[model samples]
Target: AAYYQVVPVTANVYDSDGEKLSYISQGSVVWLDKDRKSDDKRLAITISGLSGYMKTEDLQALDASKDFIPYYESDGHRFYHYVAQNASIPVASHLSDMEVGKKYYSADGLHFDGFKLENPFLFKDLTEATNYSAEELDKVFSLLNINNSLLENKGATFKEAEEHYHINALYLLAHSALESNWGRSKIAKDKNNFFGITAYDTTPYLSAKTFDDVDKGILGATKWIKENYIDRGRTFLGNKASGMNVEYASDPYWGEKIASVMMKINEKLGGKD
Candidate 1:
């Protein structure tokens, strides 16, 4: 048996009977049974106790000992992150639940795998720079078409926030849309709190922080997010194990929710660049 890691965004897994079981995300480590062969070009493998078949092309040989991989589990699904050499994890906000650079593993104690797992639904790093121009962002915003939404036509504002903070403008735009309900929430309309920041679970409405205006809100939220989450190595929209979703939001799938909005915006912009 040899260990391999998935290279595709997603790889289909099937039971021994050739029935579809489930698909594993990219960067997932699996043990390949070299002696076993599948009839349909699928490799016999085992991942997290599940015996299945997967396409051979989707996997690459892995030497776990010399590799350092990081993955976050959300709702029983594992998503991996790829860290490039000489690149430090971006720091923005701060938290206390997890150490900044700790090695974590699944229940079975297999060293998790990592890479920019390319699932269309997976979230991009929030702390990265954006390639989208303001006008292009405006075009994507226009697709939302929300009448009277405060976020309407604020592409430049998001762009500026990214310019100053180095966060992704498109991600900020999508996050504001989700948190503010397309900028129709009362806090967004009145307090200009587009991100719903400082709104604790006990008192969401009453405690929601207020901003002087939409631009300030956008800028302030960008800085706050970077310092509190991104700077602390929670740059991804991952679950509790890692990423901003751990402490930035109560919902476990908050990362996925924001990423979905990003996908819609990208889809309208002729797909992610």
Candidate 2:
């Protein structure tokens, strides 16, 4: 649903994956799942990617300076960037669906869904309790990363996620790269969550489902995409009134944006996929 990144200047030197990793040193990004800050000590940031204490000076707390809203004009689309805590490091974002210049928030200096994140575990109102604790969430993330790591050997390609779903793998990846800001999504980090599956069915937490792992999120997302785009058949169809582009987004620009990003992705990938 969302994510953060890791920007390391001093070699990002932590020997072990410790809990494992996603160092900002690479295009490093992590999920902001658990956080603890005390007056005397630096904040303890817990990402599904790695572990241990983080320095206060390292806090890349994302805010308005670069926290932009996704909007369309003739120039280009401006995507929002939000680092987890440090004033530096990795950042996170969700593509905006709201109108431009509106700021996309219900209030200022305060954001997020109505009180969902104000509690423990981010359970979103649970009645019964299971053995599923935060630890399990960590396990899910680790396994998820491992699974994704095996995909196409490197470079964030889609094979596993697209194999079963039977959709165009490149399209799947391009959609992910755009929707997820190249998989540095906070939702990808913490929840292994699929895009747009933010709410629960017990799911998209925006109409999304919380995936225990990344592969799970991928699988589920593609399934939805299949049904979503299949109506228009295997090709891009014109006419916002009845095509997949219209169904793909609420705004009128979904087609243009989708094609635009696909071209960028293709050019980078050397016209493959």
lDDT (Cα, tens digit) per residue for candidate 2, span 1-273: 123333344113122233322222322333333443333333344332233444434444443455432211211143221222322111112234433343322111113343111111111111112222223322332433434421223222245444455555545544565455545666666665534443322223455456666666677776766665553362442223334433343322333334444444443344432
RMSD of 1: 16.5
**TM-score (all chains, Cα) for each model:** 0.57, 0.39
lDDT of 1 by residue, 44-156 (tens): 87654356687778887766677544334322222222222222221111223334445434312223343222333334667677778888887765566767878777889
* lDDT score, candidate 2, position 36: 36
Q: Which ten residues in a row have the lowest lDDT in candidate 1?
A: 85-94
